[PDB]
Amino acid sequence: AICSALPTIPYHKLADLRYLSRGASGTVSSARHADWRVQVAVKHLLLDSERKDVLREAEILHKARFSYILPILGICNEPEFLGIVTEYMPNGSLNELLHRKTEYPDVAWPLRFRILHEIALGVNYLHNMTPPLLHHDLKTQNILLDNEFHVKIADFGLGTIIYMPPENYESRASIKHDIYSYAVITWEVLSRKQPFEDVTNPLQIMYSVSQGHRPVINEESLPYDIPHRARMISLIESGWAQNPDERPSFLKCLIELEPVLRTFEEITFLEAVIQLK
Amino acid sequence: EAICSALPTIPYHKLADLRYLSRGASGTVSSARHADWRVQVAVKHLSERKDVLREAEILHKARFSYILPILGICNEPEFLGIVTEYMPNGSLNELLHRKTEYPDVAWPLRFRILHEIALGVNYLHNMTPPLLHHDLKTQNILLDNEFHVKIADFGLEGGTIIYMPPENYEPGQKSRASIKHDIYSYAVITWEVLSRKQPFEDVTNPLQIMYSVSQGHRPVINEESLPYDIPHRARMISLIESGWAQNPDERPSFLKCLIELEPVLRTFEEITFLEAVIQLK
Ligand SMILES: CC(C)(C)S(=O)(=O)c1ccc2nccc(Nc3[nH]nc4ccc(F)cc34)c2c1
Ligand SMILES: CC(C)(C)S(=O)(=O)c1ccc2nccc(Nc3[nH]nc4ccc(F)cc34)c2c1
């Protein structure tokens, strides 16, 4: 019986508003809060219904507060400006980390596994809310990284189709969507390759997928020296199975990952991160 | 007008591996793991019922980057308790005073910690209505996996007196509403952080301390406790001295302290923070 209101932030309290990116849900800018003295992120798109969406997103971030979910700091709601304010993630997205190879030549295994564990922890948290909250748009672009490269998931429960399960083409009630996305992401994290790299059309991907084809698993995509290779391959293969019923819950997924994570000393995570600086 | 988040209720039986950590004024604290969420957690437990409920409500309302995150509440016939994220690195107190376990504590880490305590307390003060700590000490500044600060036990056997401003020695409606209590505590903490020494180490009589403190005395700001090599020494000593001023109206706000601290922090390269943590492992 304990409630908490989301702070309202006066637009005039946000200084140095610089453009970061624009996307389907709005434009994201970095700023600083004049009173709290911290860097923040601001998201802004006004139609009669376009308002109910921004407010629903903010309500979602506020209810889904957890260690691996992007923390919301407050709603900026005035007659002039309408925006969401959250912590600022200084390390970008998992997509950048995996694919900017000149900037990041080495991403050590312990850090890759910690990221995979945290993405699962975050999604598992969502699924355990009452009522259950489904992500449905999980991708490397919205898995964000904080100052120590810990995961904060964003843009859930509200572009690219490589993370979308086949049954989702021709559904909104499916609890086996997220795990599908997760299998692809896992493949992507362990290989640092773009899923279906030889495809010149999104439709060609969607076609292959509907026919049961998946990102390639072989020695070139996943070298034999990858720690716990066999176990990860099983997890990936069951996660993206054509038949949703054969896909594991996140509970099962976490239970499989726990013994893998225990094999890594806490200092190896710190060393992996400092290597990136 | 506003959007509302309900604090989750956590069944006690959902907590596995419950182990004892410590017994504090407000209750027993234990570590555990949540069976469904698969994360480690801390659990605080003991009609002295609406006291637990109030602490929970406060933690829930004061959610912020430098405040201990609450995950849910345990409210059952048998058991009452609060559940929060587990802090793997203890308290600031153990960091400063366990010199064997922690031979070095690099300046950049010390300054980030000071900067974070300030951001935390400042945030409380800026809520509406302003929320005041009044028992800020090194024992309840908690440290996360990468030594970032999370402040606990605000707005709520007796403890230490060294962080208490003289005027509060005999409490009333005047001092319980004082918006200059926390800054005094912060000043002492700032001194304790920069020196790794117990304030009033010489005096081993807590009551004697209270007299000395009432007379104007503060911890020893000499060369012996605060070496000349301390980064931005002059600027820090100035911050401390004005923070623990015998007169409440001569004490600065936290927003004021932050604005001075900002330039100091910018002088340390990011890499040094990570280097400080690896050295502590
Ligand atoms: C993604 C990128 C790395 C290309 S970015 O440079 O655009 C970037 C960087 C840093 C961020 N830090 C925090 C939050 C970001 N975005 C958001 N996703 N969902 C949001 C909902 C509300 C909100 F206020 C911000 C939201 C960030 C975006
Ligand atoms: C202090 C120590 C380092 C000697 S400890 O070993 O007791 C310790 C270790 C780790 C912790 N992690 C988190 C929170 C702790 N304590 C708490 N303060 N306020 C709380 C309110 C609710 C709650 F659930 C826990 C709370 C911790 C305490």
CATH number at residue B213: 1.10.510.10
Cα gap A79→A218, rounded to integer Å = 56
| Gap from CA of B126 to ligand 1 centroid (Å) | 25
Chain A, chain B: beta-carbon pairs less than 8 Å apart: 97
Whether residue A130 contacts residue B10, with contact meaning beta carbons closer than 8 Å, is answered with no
The residues, any chain, with a CB within 8 Å of residue A186's CB and separated by 6 or more, are A116, A232, A235, A236, A239
Q: Is the CB of B44 under 6 A from ligand 2?
A: yes
What residues form DSSP beta bridges with A3? B6
Of B161, B144, B93, B148, give the one whose Cα is nearest residue B117.
B148
- Report the alpha-carbon distance of residue B154 to residue B186 in Å, rounded: 14
User: Element (H or E) spanning B270, and its range?
Assistant: helix B270-280
Q: Which two tokens stand for residue B7?
A: 């604090």
Residue with token string 């923390």: A71
Alpha-carbon distance of A250 to A125, in angstroms, equals 9
Report which of B214, B190, B212, B189 is spatially closest to residue B200, judged by C-alpha positions: B212
Which site among B9, B33, B38 would you substitute to test the A interface, given the most A Cβ atoms closer than 10 Å to its Cβ?
A: B38
Secondary structure (3-state) at B91: strand
Nearest CA to ligand 1 atom 7: A21
Q: Quick check: A71 contacting B, CB < 8 Å?
A: yes
**Ligand 2 contact via B87 beta carbon (within 6 Å):** yes
Pocket test for ligand 2, best of B22, B142, B151, B153 (most atoms within 8 A of CB): B142
Task: Answer whether B150 contacts ligand 2 (Cβ < 6 A).
Answer: no
DSSP string, B23-78: EETTEEEEEEEETTT--EEEEEE--TTHHHHHHHHHHHHT--TTBPPEEEEEE-SS
Q: Which 8-state DSSP code applies to residue B9?
A: B
CA distance A139 to A163: 6
Burial class of B75 by CB neighbour count within 10 A (0 to 12, 13 to 18, 19+):
buried
Nearest-CA residue of chain B relative to A88? B65
Interchain pair B255, A4: CB under 8 A: no
Pick from B218, B224, B215: nearest CA to B195: B224
- How remote is the CA of residue A154 from the centroid of ligand 1, in Å? 8
* Cβ-based neighbours of B79, under 8 Å, separated by 6 or more: B12, B45
* Experimentally determined by: X-ray
For A144, counting Cβ atoms within 10 Å of its Cβ (0-12 exposed, 13-18 middle, 19+ buried), the class is: buried
> Is the distance from CB of A73 to CB of A86 less than 8 angstroms?
yes
- Annotation says A137 is catalytic: yes
For B56, list phi and psi in degrees, rounded to 5: -65, -45
A251 near B CB under 8 A: yes
Q: From A71, A60, A59, A80, select the one nearest A13 (Cα to Cα).
A: A80
Secondary structure of B207-247 in HEC code, one letter for each residue: HHHHHHHHCCCCCCCCCCCCCCCCCCHHHHHHHHHHHCCCC
Beta bridge partners of B128: none
How far is ligand 2, taken at its centre, from the CA of residue B189, in Å? 19
What DSSP character marks residue B253?
P
Residues with Cβ within 8 Å of B102's Cβ and at least 6 positions away in sequence, in order, are B95, B280
B122 contacts chain A (CB < 8 A)? yes
Catalytic residue (one of A137, A146, A155, A225): A137
Q: Distance between CA atoms of B206 and A20, rounded to whole angstroms?
A: 55
What spatial distance separates the first Cα and last Cα of chain A, rounded to whole Å? 45
Q: Report the gap between the CA of B16 and the closest CA in chain A (Å).
A: 15
CB A99 within 8 A of CB A192: yes
Q: Please say whether the beta carbons of B72 and B8 come within 8 A.
A: yes
B270 contacts chain A (CB < 8 A): yes
Of A5, A67, A147, the CB nearest to B4: A5
Phi, psi of A8, deg, nearest 5: -100, 130
The verdict on whether omega for the bond into residue A131 sits within 30 degrees of 0, i.e. cis, is yes
B1, B4, B5: best to mutate for the A interface, most A CBs within 10 A = B5
Distance of CA A76 from the midpoint of ligand 1 (Å):
16
Q: B3 and A277 in contact by Cβ < 8 A?
A: no
B91 among annotated binding-site residues: no
Helix (H) or strand (E) holding B117: helix B107-125
B186 three-class SS: helix
Exposure letters B23-55 (e unless 16+ CB within 10 A, then b): eeebbebbbbbbeebbbebbbbbeeeeeebeeb
Tell me the helix, strand and coil percentages in chain B, rounded to 5: 40, 15, 45
Q: What is the b/e burial string over A207-220, where b = at least 16 CB atoms within 10 angstroms of the residue's CB?
A: eebeeeebbeeeee
Q: How far is the CA of A224 from the centre of ligand 1 (A)?
A: 35
Give me B88's structure tokens.
């793997």
The answer to whether the beta carbons of residues A97 and A107 sit under 8 Å apart is yes
- Cα distance between the two ends of chain B: 47
Q: Do B155 and B58 form a contact (C-beta atoms < 8 A)?
A: yes
CA distances (Å), origin B274, targets A16, A90, B68: 27, 15, 22
How far apart CA B181 and CA B162 sit, in angstroms, is 12
Q: Which range marks the domain in which residue A143 is found?
A: 1-277
Residue A212 CB contacts under 8 Å (≥ 6 apart), including other chains: A166, A242
Report d(CA A230, CA A237) in Å as an integer.
11
Give the C-alpha separation, B1 to A269, whole Å. 43
Cβ-based neighbour number of residue B244 at 10 Å = 24
A41 forms beta bridges with: A30, A86
Cβ–Cβ < 8 Å for B90, B138: no
Distance from CA of B57 to the nearest CA of A (A): 6
**Would you say A214 and A234 are in contact if contact means Cβ atoms under 8 Å apart?**
no
The total number of structural domains in chain B stands at 1
Give the angle A248-A251-A254 at the CA atoms, nearest 5°: 95
Q: A-chain residues within 8 Å CB-CB of B71?
A: 66
Contact A128 B36 (CB under 8 A): yes
**Interchain contact B260–A (C-beta under 8 A):** no
Calculate the alpha carbon distances from A181 to A8, A81, A199 in Å.
Answer: 34, 34, 19
CA distance to A104, A113, A264, B63, per residue, from A268 (Å): 17, 11, 7, 31
Q: Within a 10 A sphere around the Cβ of A232, how many other Cβ atoms?
A: 21
Please name the helix (run of DSSP H) or strand (run of DSSP E) that holds residue B22, with its range, or none: strand B15-24
* Alpha-carbon span A164 to A181, nearest angstrom: 6
Please state the three-class secondary structure of chain A as a single string: CCEEECCECCHHHEEEEEEEEEECCEEEEEEEECCCCCEEEEEECCCCCHHHHHHHHHHHHHHCCCCCECCEEEEEECCCCEEEEEECCCCCEHHHHHHCCCCCCCCCHHHHHHHHHHHHHHHHHHHHCCCCCCCCCCCHHHEEECCCCCEEECCCCCCCCCCCCHHHCCCCCCCCHHHHHHHHHHHHHHHCCCCCCCCCCHHHHHHHHHCCCCCCCCCCCCCCCCCCHHHHHHHHHHHCCCCHHHCCCHHHHHHHHHHHHHCCCHHHHHHHHHHHC
The token pair that represents B136 in the structure block = 């800020």
B200: left (phi over 0), alpha (psi -120 to 50) or beta: left
Is residue A156 within 8 Å of residue A141, measured between CB atoms? Answer: no
Breaks (C-N over 2.5 A) in chain B follow: 46, 156
Cα B16 from Cα A154, distance rounded (Å): 29
**Contact indicator for B41, B71 with CB cutoff of 8 Å:** yes
B119 min Cα distance to partner chain A (Å): 7
Q: How far apart are CA B248 and CA A255, in angstroms?
A: 55
B133 C-beta neighbours (distance < 10 Å), count: 21
Backbone angles phi, psi at B87, to 5 degrees: -100, 105
What lies within 8 Å, CB to CB, of A252 at 6+ separation is: none
* Under 8 Å between Cβ of B123 and B171: no
Distance (Å, whole) CA A25 – CA A155: 8
